[PDB]
Design a protein around this ligand. Structure first.
Ligand SMILES: Nc1ncnc2c1ncn2[C@@H]1O[C@H](COP(=O)(O)OP(=O)(O)OP(=O)(O)O)[C@@H](O)[C@H]1O
Ligand SMILES: Nc1ncnc2c1ncn2[C@@H]1O[C@H](COP(=O)(O)OP(=O)(O)O)[C@@H](O)[C@H]1O
Ligand SMILES: [Mg+2]
Ligand SMILES: [Mg+2]
Lengths: 346, 593, 173
């Protein structure tokens, strides 16, 4: 296709240069026949010869640069097509003075009649759900795959189409909030690990605003301190593109160490323990439940023996709260979906 | 369709065979001598048409010197040559027959240059594919280059070398255009013509000066645009986590300082190309100034005619008209030099050198050319046709033992005895060919319809294939629709349950899957289609409850193995890790059998 | 004319767009005037008055080449400075449904190839287009003034030029 575009473009400039040579013949014959049997004094005739040669030189460059200007203005058409896109409408309806300086003080996460979608056209993936969360209430969420588990963690940051509801933390409405103030102070950690290339200090803290004692204690409470201190950089060492210098469990563990530098009140997790083994997984649950007493920790369960020592357990099957009770109560009821999930595991 | 295939002289693997045949004629000079040995035979043909053009374009000024000197001014039949070449109609029809032949030979000399650039593009794309099929993964992982730099090299630097070869015979006409124009100027005006000397020496010192300042712009420009494309690629890959952490202003100001640091080099580049085209288009008007005031002042007047004036004006215009392209020519050849140096930096990179199948025996495997060995002294007796689990903590070697048996690692010591053959391998991060879902599952095997309906039903792809808008024919991947990740891991391990390759290296399939779907992997498929026929499945997972279903267990800790063997062997000899697995599964009462 | 050249002229600005046209057409018409003064200076049979204003009319053509050159680099550099620094801040404030429904190679394609084309590949083609078609239309302004017989021949060649341009342009697109 590039040789056919070549031979077509040379066909066009062959016929345009042949038309320009016909211009040189017609203008040359009429400039000698306009001055033989008349008087035109030959400087205008040599002017017409030189500018007729300028027509023959610069006609093919005109049509070549016009077709190249069309093909290069297609790039401006592509960037102008991308440029008038949708914005997320970042500013909220509340004034920023009315939210506190210490906004995440204690977590009264009220949920009433929530139902989400992802856009306008789709089905509701969450059914009508309601919960009342205490600030010392370290809840967990089980379920099946596709039942609304990661969408329930993404609905706290207005990432999905929350078209209704009463998702209000601390008496202040979350839809009436600035989005940088909302997604600053609350911290999710995803299942798929995303790291950025550069250094470890930047990949935990890109502002360089927290201390090295806080980064070393966040690697202490992740258990990656003996891994990174035995590396030849120690700290400020190279993480490459995609995090492919390290393992996938180390990529999830750097996502944990990036989650632990910004302090919180509303630690929410996805299933971050997917690629981690059960030994260091049960080590890391024993640290961060004890190192974070006051902070409300929500975690999507991937292993239910990790989730078994929580305060209350939500069970989300097909987008609805089937169960919201004590884990020993749902274990002793012995027909429940939480009991069959812990029965199918072990 | 119906444009048809290209002929045999412009195929890839007809050229690239000539390019590797130029390689065994024994840095970047070997690539340049290989290109001048390979494609120079048709490059001198396009230069032959380029030099047969524009000496026939030198009939313009001789025609103007003919007819304006005419127009100011056996013995009864015949016409001599000085009477023949001093009439305006016969010289004007000779001007028409000159421009048709020179403006056909120019469009032939464009075509042979663009056709050899296209054959250079095919040969260097096949040589870049033969380099990338032998590249080690330590080039991509540990440091040196990126995947975006490797696919950016074929998208940019191949096209920069090709656009240099589009303008390659124009540089070899730049001697012969100026020299024959100087001798044709010396025929017309004589010794007053050489004091139009702004052209005839060019100040090609200052042209070489602005060429090396365009080199000083251009190397920093390509380094900053590769850094900016690397930063924009990691930002748009991680925009979900960057929006959720609200770090978009911090990463945007990093990309904006990279864009302004590129933009200062673009300020220097556009100012230096501006003074190059100012020097380039203000030299010949100054040359007709110093030759036309210098004809009638400082030199006594030898026949200042309209014929010699418009002959010298059209001769300076035909002398100036290929000189207008020279700033694009020098930016194309400095883009070629940075292109072939980044090409020669890529092709010299690091590369790849009785009951059982694989006999890794005392093998030290290392990820690094200079570092300590990651995999330590290990001895593996993986059996034929049986399920085998590699278990361990984070960063003990559970993917590097699988990549060691492929030969991806740097083997320091030991020996690996295979049967290498085909091996079904679904990796830790999954991989999606950007096609239809069925063509990602088939993966250039024969279309077995009953096995294809079996492995959908083995690992439950039917309710997530019913939700798709085209089912099997949905375009998943990067180009096209986005999946969840739970379907991506299942769609990567469903193609390694299919491909008949008899050694299955299943890396961890139960990250993104739940308990019920992981058991539906574990009941049918694994233990029912991979142990149906005698297929060796090496299934490393962290899901320790499937260690009952294990004919061989390899334990991993800190780069070495502890012991290999079965679960009753781990019951007999070790017992500390057996009591650790009894405490981790919370199966204190029953036994791991 | 598409919408993209309208967005190109608005993003460059009218203060450099007015300096784009009113340097170049003045430079090509004084090129027509110095070649007409070269025609009239050879019609000799007044001494050096067709030399001195030819000298100052060539040096004004030299500095008009300079202001045309700094205008074309400053328009290309200003549209490199302004288009990127707007697409980046408009595309980072997108919703996540916009990233979910698009190919990622399209958004990386419009930050690499089209930002490569807009920066350095466009203004060399713009200066060659403006210089080449303005030299061609001022050359056609030269041969009307010498010869009025050319205008009855000019219309069928421009008609077959426009017919071969359309007849090529559908196949080339
Ligand atoms: N691509 C790589 N390049 C260089 N070093 C690596 C690479 N991958 C892993 N390593 C190093 O090798 C060690 C073993 O990692 P490996 O590849 O076995 O992942 P893994 O331990 O299987 O991951 P997981 O335990 O999460 O499944 C890690 O400690 C890491 O430091
Ligand atoms: N980009 C998207 N657009 C529309 N629906 C989505 C998107 N991503 C996820 N979903 C829907 O959200 C549902 C819940 O998925 P998720 O919460 O991610 O995992 P789980 O299935 O474990 O609850 C899925 O059934 C899926 O159909
Ligand atoms: Mg989910
Ligand atoms: Mg691994």
């Amino acid at each position: 296709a590039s040789l056919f575009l070549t031979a077509a473009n040379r066909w066009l400039e062959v016929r345009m240069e042949y038309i320009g040579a016909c211009v040189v013949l017609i203008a040359a014959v009429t400039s000698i026949s306009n001055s033989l049997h008349r008087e035109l004094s030959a400087g205008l005739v040599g002017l017409g010869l030189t500018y007729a040669l300028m027509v023959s030189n610069y006609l093919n460059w005109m049509v070549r640069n016009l077709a190249d200007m069309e093909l290069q203005l297609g790039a401006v058409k592509r960037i102008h097509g991308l440029l008038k896109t949708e914005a997320e409408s970042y500013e909220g309806l509340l004034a920023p003075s009315l939210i506190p300086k210490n906004w995440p003080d204690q977590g009264k996460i009220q949920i009433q009649n929530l139902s989400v979608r992802y856009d306008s056209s789709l089905k509701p993936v969450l059914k009508h759900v309601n919960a009342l969360i205490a600030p010392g209430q370290k809840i967990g969420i089980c379920g099946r795959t596709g039942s609304g588990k990661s969408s329930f963690s993404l609905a706290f940051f207005r990432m999905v189409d929350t078209f209704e509801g009463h998702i209000i933390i601390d008496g202040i409405d979350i839809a009436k909030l600035p989005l940088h103030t909302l997604r600053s102070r609350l911290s999710i950690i995803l299942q798929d690990p995303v790291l950025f290339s550069g250094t470890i200090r930047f990949n935990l803290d890109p502002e360089r605003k927290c201390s090295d004692s806080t980064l070393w204690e966040a690697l202490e409470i992740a258990q990656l301190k003996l891994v990174v201190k035995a590396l030849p950089g120690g700290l400020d060492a190279i993480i490459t593109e995609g995090g492919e210098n390290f393992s996938q469990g180390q990529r999830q563990l750097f996502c944990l160490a990036r989650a632990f530098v910004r302090k919180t009140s509303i630690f929410i997790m996805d299933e971050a323990t997917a690629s981690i083994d059960m030994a260091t997984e049960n080590i890391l649950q024993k640290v961060v439940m004890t190192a974070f007493a006051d902070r409300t920790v929500v975690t999507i369960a991937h292993r239910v023996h990790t989730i078994l020592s929580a305060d209350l357990v939500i069970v989300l099957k097909r987008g609805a709260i089937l169960e919201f009770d004590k884990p020993e109560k749902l274990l002793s009821r012995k027909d429940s979906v939480f009991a069959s999930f812990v029965r199918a595991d072990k | 369709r119906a444009i048809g295939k290209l002929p045999i002289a412009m195929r890839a693997l007809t050229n690239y065979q000539r390019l590797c045949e130029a390689f065994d004629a024994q840095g970047a000079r070997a690539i340049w001598q290989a290109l001048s040995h390979a494609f120079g035979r048709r490059l001198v043909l396009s230069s032959t048409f380029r030099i047969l053009a524009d000496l026939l374009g030198f009939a313009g000024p001789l025609c103007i010197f003919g007819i304006v000197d005419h127009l100011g001014k056996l013995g009864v039949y015949f016409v001599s040559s000085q009477e023949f070449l001093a009439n305006a109609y016969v010289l004007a029809v000779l001007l028409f027959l000159a421009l048709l032949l020179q403006r056909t030979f120019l469009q032939a000399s464009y075509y042979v240059a663009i056709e050899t650039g296209i054959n250079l593009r095919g040969a260097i794309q096949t040589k870049i594919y033969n380099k990338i099929m032998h590249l080690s993964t330590s080039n991509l992982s540990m440091g040196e280059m990126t995947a975006g730099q490797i696919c950016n090299l074929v998208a940019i630097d191949t096209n920069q070398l090709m656009w240099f070869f589009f303008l390659c015979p124009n540089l070899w006409a730049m001697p012969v255009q100026i020299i024959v124009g100087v001798i044709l100027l010396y025929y017309i005006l004589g010794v007053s013509a050489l004091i139009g000397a702004a052209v005839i020496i060019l100040l090609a010192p200052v042209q070489y000066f602005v060429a090396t300042k365009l080199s000083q712009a251009q190397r920093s420009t390509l380094e900053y645009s590769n850094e900016r494309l690397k930063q924009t690629n990691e930002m748009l890959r991680g925009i979900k986590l960057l929006k959720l952490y609200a770090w978009e202003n911090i990463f945007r100001t990093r990309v904006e300082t990279t864009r302004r640091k590129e933009m200062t080099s673009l300020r220097a580049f556009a100012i230096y190309t501006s003074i190059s085209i100012f020097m380039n288009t203000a030299i010949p008007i100054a040359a007709v100034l110093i030759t036309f005031v210098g004809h009638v002042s400082f030199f006594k007047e030898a026949d200042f005619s309209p014929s010699v004036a418009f002959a010298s004006l059209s001769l300076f215009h035909i002398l100036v008209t290929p000189l207008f392209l020279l700033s694009s020519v020098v930016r194309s050849t400095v883009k070629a030099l940075v292109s072939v140096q980044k090409l020669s930096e890529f092709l010299s990179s690091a590369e790849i050198r009785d009951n059982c199948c694989v006999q890794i025996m005392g093998g030290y495997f290392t990820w690094t050319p200079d570092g300590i060995p990651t995999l330590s002294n290990i001895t593996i007796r993986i059996p034929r046709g049986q399920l085998t689990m590699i278990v361990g903590q984070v960063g003990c070697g559970k993917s590097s033992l699988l990549l060691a048996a492929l030969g991806e690692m740097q083997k320091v010591s030991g020996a690996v005895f295979w049967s290498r053959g085909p091996v079904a391998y679904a990796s830790q991060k999954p991989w999606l060919l950007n096609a239809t879902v069925e063509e990602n599952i088939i993966f250039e095997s024969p279309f077995n319809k009953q096995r294809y309906k079996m492995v959908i039903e083995a690992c439950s792809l039917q309710p997530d294939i019913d939700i798709l808008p085209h089912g099997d024919q949905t375009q998943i991947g990067e180009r096209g629709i986005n999946l969840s990740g739970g379907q991506r891991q299942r769609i990567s391990v469903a193609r390694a349950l299919y491909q008949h390759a008899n050694v299955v290296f299943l890396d961890d399939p139960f990250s993104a899957l739940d308990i019920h779907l992981s058991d539906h992997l574990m009941q049918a498929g694994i233990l029912e289609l991979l142990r149906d026929d005698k297929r060796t499945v090496v299934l490393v997972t962290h899901k320790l409850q499937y260690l009952p279903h294990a004919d061989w267990i390899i334990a991993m800790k800190d780069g070495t193995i502890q012991r290999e063997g079965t679960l009753k062997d781990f019951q007999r000899s070790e017992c500390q890790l057996f009591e650790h697995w009894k405490t981790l599964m919370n199966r204190q009462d029953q036994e791991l059998e | 004319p598409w919408r993209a050249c309208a967005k190109y002229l608005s993003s460059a600005g009218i203060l450099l767009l007015s300096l784009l046209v009113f340097s170049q057409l003045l430079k090509h018409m004084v090129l027509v005037a110095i070649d007409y003064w070269l025609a009239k200076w050879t019609d000799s049979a007044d001494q050096t008055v067709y030399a001195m204003v030819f000298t100052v009319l060539c040096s004004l053509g030299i500095v008009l080449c300079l202001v045309t050159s700094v205008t074309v680099e400053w328009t290309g550099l200003k549209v490199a400075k302004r288009l990127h620094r707007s697409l980046l801040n408009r595309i980072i404030l997108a919703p996540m449904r916009f990233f979910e429904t698009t190919p990622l190679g399209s958004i990386l394609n419009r930050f690499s190839s089209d930002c490569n084309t807009i920066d350095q590949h466009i203004p060399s083609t713009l200066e060659c287009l403006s210089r080449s078609t303005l030299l061609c239309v001022s050359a056609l302004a030269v041969i009307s003034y010498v010869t009025p017989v050319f205008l009855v021949a000019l219309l069928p060649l421009a008609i077959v030029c426009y017919f071969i341009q359309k007849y090529f342009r559908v196949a080339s697109r």
